[PDB]
Amino acid sequence: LVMQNVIGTLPPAQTSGSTPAFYSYKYNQPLISQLNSNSLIAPLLMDTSASQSGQDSGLTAKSQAQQALNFIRYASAQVTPPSLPKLSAYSELWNQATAKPNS
Amino acid sequence: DITQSSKAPNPPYSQLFNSNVVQLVQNYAYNTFLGAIPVDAMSQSLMNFVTDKVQGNSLINNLANTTFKYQNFSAPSSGADGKITANGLIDQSTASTYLNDPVSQAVFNILGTPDYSFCMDNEQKNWLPNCNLMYQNLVMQNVIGTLPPAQTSGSTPAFYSYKYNQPLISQLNSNSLIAPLLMDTSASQSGQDSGLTAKSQAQQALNFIRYASAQVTPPSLPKLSAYSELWNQATAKPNSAGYNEVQQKQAAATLSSYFNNLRVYAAQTSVGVSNLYYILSKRLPQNMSADQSNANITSQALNEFNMATRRLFDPTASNTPGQPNQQWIKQINDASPATVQKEIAILLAEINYQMYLDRQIQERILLTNSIMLLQNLKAAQPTADFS
Amino acid sequence: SNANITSQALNEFNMATRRLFDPTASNTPGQPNQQWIKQINDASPATVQKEI
Amino acid sequence: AILLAEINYQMYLDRQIQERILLTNSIMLLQNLKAAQPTADFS
Amino acid sequence: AGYNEVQQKQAAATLSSYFNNLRVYAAQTSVGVSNLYYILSKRLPQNMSADQ
Structure with missing residues (x-):
């Protein structure tokens, strides 16, 4: 969603x-x-x-300062965030990780 | 020895040897420095070095991209004059006509150099007779x-x-x-006439700098057929016209992440090409006088070489005793104390200027190494794989 | 009321670049706030040492 | 006077050297980044 | 003479890309060659006086 925006x-x-x-x-x-x-x-x-006003959609910058901000976001690879865990697998191995002692 | 009036100087001197020459040198210094910095060249406000509120806004803003505007980079050069230009052999055109800044021009090549597939049939079997668009294979054959x-x-x-x-x-x-x-x-x-060739030492520099930037291998843009079906799949309204939402958002994410990789790549290149083009641009000639009949030509590096080596052996300085415009050091040997403290003041002022542009070298070091860190750590994205 | 604006790069710029050429400076002789080198051209030894 | 003269000269050439590192780091950035051409593969 | 256009341009592309990588590599190595020659060249003898 974030990099579709x-x-x-x-x-x-x-x-x-x-x-x-x-x-x-x-x-x-x-x-x-x-x-x-x-x-x-x-x-x-x-x-x-x-x-x-360049693009009606997406990350659009209305000012030269915002041009620099857009580039600093792009160069920092910020438009692509890292991959966070899946729910099903993470919930399973969390449930195992937070296992009560011999319970 | 005060006792002899004859051995004292006559007439006295308390001013600098020649304020006019250092004045012209210094104005040329400012002009070359403010002109030599590469700046995004697309609209008048875009190269604005300063805002309108600070005094002298016009007379800084007009000197943005001086080297390339004087050089007519946007207008293609016929080659008979050996001018730095956007070659119509490597660079894509703005007509579906070239961009004013070489760095933005390079990243524009990165983003807008299509695959050969758009000049194929949609079954990748034959070749269209005429294809106005400029694909990567065609350009690097050129x-x-x-x-x-x-x-x-x-x-x-x-x-x-x-x-x-x-x-x-x-x-x-x-x-x-x-x-x-x-x-x-x-x-x-006049080099060998097969594809790209340098018609000047300046063109030799340009062809080197583009060669180092590796623009001759523009990235592989999407296949027409492949990308087009993922387009049809993703851009469509979900659950209508025989579509749905699952692979819609899926393929949408895939294509969008692909172009995201393209733009982050292109920004990282724009970094490097920007510094390379600034190194190139410190050394281009710039016009000092608005009137061309009185036009003066000096470069940032040439003129800064003159800030360096005018106190030392100067080629135009007289090297025979008894002539005016003597060498600097001999002139000190016969100078007055007020004059000598005067010259210390000015030369150390030039110290301050030059370690300023040394500053700017350094902050550019920051730019480059930070980009290389971000790229390197980008090569390592934390995967949530537990099997 | 005296709200004035600068950045740090532009301010360090005009701190460096105020003596050698100056946009605010008067470029015709006989006017005040002339170019710093021209002001030096008539400055006193005590003055120039204070500049040092 | 001559001392600050040489100072101008020397740290001028140190500036030259600094632009040389600028050049070296830039090209290594481009060659790393050339090792990273984005793939048009849609698998 | 028993040729067609498709693998003609495909083969042209393969050769041309090869020499492209070759020259890009040459540039990248030549930057190192140049700065190493520069650092040594600061240290080599030079004759100044116009007469031997």
Whole structure:
């Protein structure tokens, strides 16, 4: 769920008048800016004025400071969280782990 | 010896040897430094170094991406002038027309270089006659040019023969990036015309830096047919049109995690390509005077070399006694105490500037090693496997 | 009322980059707050030592 | 005066060396990351 | 002459990718070659005086 929110709406196969494909520059216009690392290291003081609106869905950043925030999230591999235990297996081996002494 | 008035200087000097020369040098210092930093180049506010509230906002913001805007990176270069440009041989176009920042251009290649499958049929058996789109196979064939033969022939060289390798050794040698302080902007070089070739020392640097960034092997984007059926499966409304929700969310997660891996990869590359392009950009020429008839050309590294070596042997400094514009140290030997403390003040100011840009080198060290740590620990994601 | 804004990188920048060139400085002779090197050009030895 | 002159010069060339490490670490980052091309496999 | 396009481009792709890996490797090794040559080259003899 969290990295579907990262996605927003996922981009279609071939370029169409409704929504551009995934490699098309029109679809890639907003994301390429937050995928540039200079966004973190070039500017000298960030601007937080919400003026730009690139993607109607997914992680979209309205400010250059939020561009840097989007990149720091991406580079930190934060959009992909680690895999946490399954309920069935974890509940079983927890029930075994918290076994009462000889009970 | 105060007793002799003749041995005293005449007329007296209490000012610096030449404030004008250090002034021009210093303004060029500022211009080169603020121009040399690579900055996201897509919209006017996007390269804004500073906000509008700080004084002098315009005269810092206008100097963002100076090296590439002067160089016309966005507009492809014909090659007759040997200008740094987005080659229409490796770089995808914005038309389904090139991006203004080489680093964003590179990560844009990473994200937007399709597989050959979109230029196949949907059964991966034959090839379309015309395909405007630029797939990874096609671009890196273009990097080859004509593929070279096995045994050297009278017409064509073997791939190992030195005559085949005459340009490639320069293209591929690392020093093409580091040793020069200002790249040659004149297309005095005409290499072998097969695919990518450098027409200038600056192009030699560019082709090296892209070669190191390994853009010639763009990542394998999804198959048209495979991805398209998982698309049809996932994007559809669940429990309608012969669909459901289980594999819908499942395949949705699979494709989305795939593109997530792509973008984290691309950001990690953008890091490295950003530093490489900054190393390259410290050494590009920049225009100092707005009027081209009076235009001055100096680079960040060249000009910073001048901050270094103007107090030392200066090539234009006179080296014969009795002439003006003498060498710096001999000028000190005949200088006044007020003048000498004056010059100590200024040279140590230049100390402060230069260990500032040393700061910036260092924080870039942080950038790189932190990224490499995150990648390395990403290679180790805690699995919840208990069997 | 005097709410003014800076970051730490930009502030360390203009702390480093205030003497050599200055945007606020007057670039025409005869005006106040000229370039630091030009102000030095008429400064007293005690003044320059305090700068040191 | 000449002492701080040499100081400018020397720690200038140390700056050169620092940009050299910058270069080395950058390329090792790219080659590690090249060892990690994302897979278009949908198994 | 008994050829068709599909394995033609497939084979072209295999060769071209091979040389691509070759040149990328060459660049990566050559950075190390260059800095090692630099560190040694700071230490080699040089003649300054224009007359031998």
